[PDB]
Amino acid sequence: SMFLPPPECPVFEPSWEEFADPFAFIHKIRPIAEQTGICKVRPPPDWQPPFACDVDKLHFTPRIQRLNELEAQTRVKRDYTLRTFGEMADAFKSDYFNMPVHMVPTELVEKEFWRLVSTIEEDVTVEYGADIASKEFGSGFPVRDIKLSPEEEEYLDSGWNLNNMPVMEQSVLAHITADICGMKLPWLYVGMCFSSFCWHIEDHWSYSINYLHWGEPKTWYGVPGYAAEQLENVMKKLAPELFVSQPLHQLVTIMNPNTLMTHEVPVYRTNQCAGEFVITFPRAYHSGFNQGFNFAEAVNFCTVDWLPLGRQCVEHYRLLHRYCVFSHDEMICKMASKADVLDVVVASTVQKDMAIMIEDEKALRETVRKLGVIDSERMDFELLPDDERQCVKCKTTCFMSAISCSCKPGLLVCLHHVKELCSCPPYKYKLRYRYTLDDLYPMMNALKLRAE
Numbered sequence: 001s002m003f004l005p006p007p008e009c010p011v012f013e014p015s016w017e018e019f020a021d022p023f024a025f026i027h028k029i030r031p032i033a034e035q036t037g038i039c040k041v042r043p044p045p046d047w048q049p050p051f052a053c054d055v056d057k058l059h060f061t062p063r064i065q066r067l068n069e070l071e072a073q074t075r076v077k078r079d080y081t082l083r084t085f086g087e088m089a090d091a092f093k094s095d096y097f098n099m100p101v102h103m104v105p106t107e108l109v110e111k112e113f114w115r116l117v118s119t120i121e122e123d124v125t126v127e128y129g130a131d132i133a134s135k136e137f138g139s140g141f142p143v144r145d146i147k148l149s150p151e152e153e154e155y156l157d158s159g160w161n162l163n164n165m166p167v168m169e170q171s172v173l174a175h176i177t178a179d180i181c182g183m184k185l186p187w188l189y190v191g192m193c194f195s196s197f198c199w200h201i202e203d204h205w206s207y208s209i210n211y212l213h214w215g216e217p218k219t220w221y222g223v224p225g226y227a228a229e230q231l232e233n234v235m236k237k238l239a240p241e242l243f244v245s246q247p248l249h250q251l252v253t254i255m256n257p258n259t260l261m262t263h264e265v266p267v268y269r270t271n272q273c274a275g276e277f278v279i280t281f282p283r284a285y286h287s288g289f290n291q292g293f294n295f296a297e298a299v300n301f302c303t304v305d306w307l308p309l310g311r312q313c314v315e316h317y318r319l320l321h322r323y324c325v326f327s328h329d330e331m332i333c334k335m336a337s338k339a340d341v342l343d344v345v346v347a348s349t350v351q352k353d354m355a356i357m358i359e360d361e362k363a364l365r366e367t368v369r370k371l372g373v374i375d376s377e378r379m380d381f382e383l384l385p386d387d388e389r390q391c392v393k394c395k396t397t398c399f400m401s402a403i404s405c406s407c408k409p410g411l412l413v414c415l416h417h418v419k420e421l422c423s424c425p426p427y428k429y430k431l432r433y434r435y436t437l438d439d440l441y442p443m444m445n446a447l448k449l450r451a452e
């Protein structure tokens with residue numbers, strides 16, 4: 001009736017030992033958590049990062065949000081101090097329910113959220129903050145500059161400090177030189193009651209990890225990675241407008257979990273409270289809303305486990321003609337080029353992915369040869385701005401190889417879309433390649449050595 005809450009997602013309480021290494025721990029829980037898409041992690045009670053801030057000096061620009069189910073919204077791109085926002089947000093929740101904010105049951109806000117997003121009689125609109133850390137509004141975790149407490153430095157380089165999550169050596173996005181700005185850096189989220197984030201998966205099917213610093217809880221819904229296409233099909237029918245192609249302007253939407261459960265999509269939920277961690281697994285759809293005033297920090301990340309998924313995702317993007325954030329192949333080769341200083345298990349996994357990359361590339365080069373492309377020249381793709389090296393057809397970011405033509409100066413196609421560049425005859429085409437097969441096999445061999 002009304003709303004049936006989805007079954008709760010797995011909750012984990014690592015001891016200090018298992019908690020010590022984030023990447024170790026995530027790998028342990030992975031067979032469990034990947035069945036539910038999201039999971040929750042409560043740090044040992046000991047572990048308590050000092051969030052220190054002046055609520056008056058931290059300003060940010062509010063984004064505005066209408067609350068209608070199945071209505072398209074864009075993924076994020078006056079002015080509030082954290083205090084004035086806190087005051088607006090508590091006033092709002094308190095007025096909406098005629099109650100003190102911490103006396104509204106979470107059950108109720110959930111019920112009420114889904115009621116007001118379906119009723120287009122109501123048009124409730126809320127505000128929120130979303131931004132990567134900057135000079136006016138910084139990470140809620142300890143960084144490096146002012147002088148820190150003796151305890152603030154304890155957490156200064158914890159693995160669960162989310163600033164450290166990109167740059168760790170068991171992470172893969174780590175050694176990406178390319179400034180994948182929005183991806184490798186933490187986002188900051190200032191919530192109020194009903195402010196929400198629509199159904200989505202992460203760029204390149206990466207993990208994410210989300211930390212609630214303080215404030216009222218955040219409610220999550222999650223779908224395991226294996227049911228992603230099932231969910232997408234359900235959303236194609238009930239809301240086909242979200243799927244019309246787009247030059248960052250992906251459309252995402254709010255949709256009732258019960259609607260998905262009804263169509264046999266497994267959904268899980270949790271309330272994330274202050275000091276708890278939520279982890280989303282690869283290709284795991286999620287959405288949720290805030291119970292009231294709160295502050296969260298989140299970051300994208302990639303493990304060795306993810307590398308094959310990372311390849312599969314880029315293949316998938318190509319079919320969808322969806323833009324890439326970074327070149328998977330460029331990442332692999334950068335790792336191969338630093339094979340000597342690589343973590344050994346990392347090296348073994350890069351090696352297996354390199355092996356696939358190379359044999360696919362061999363085949364693709366044979367194919368474009370038999371299409372009459374004869375001329376060729378090495379090309380340093382990594383020097384090109386990403387928008388200067390997308391396949392004109394499927395929009396994938398080129399790095400291993402591309403086809404150019406003197407007839408269409410500056411355009412490129414991947415080797416899958418040779419026939420889609422221009423109407424000149426094959427001998428006017430040119431294979432632009434980063435590496436010869438002879439350059440590549442030694443790069444892989446260095447990985448095999450480092451892994452033994």
Ligand SMILES: Cc1cc(C(=O)Nc2ccncc2)on1
Pocket residue numbers: 128129189190191192195196197210290296298
């Ligand atoms: C509004 C609002 C959103 C959040 C938040 O946490 N959003 C999020 C976005 C993408 N993936 C996961 C979560 O907080 N306030």
Ligand SMILES: [Cl-]
Pocket residue numbers: 067068069116117118119120121122123124
């Ligand atoms: Cl509405």
Ligand SMILES: [Mn+2]
Pocket residue numbers: 200201202208280286
């Ligand atoms: Mn997300």
Ligand SMILES: [Zn+2]
Pocket residue numbers: 391392393394395396413414415416417
């Ligand atoms: Zn292409």
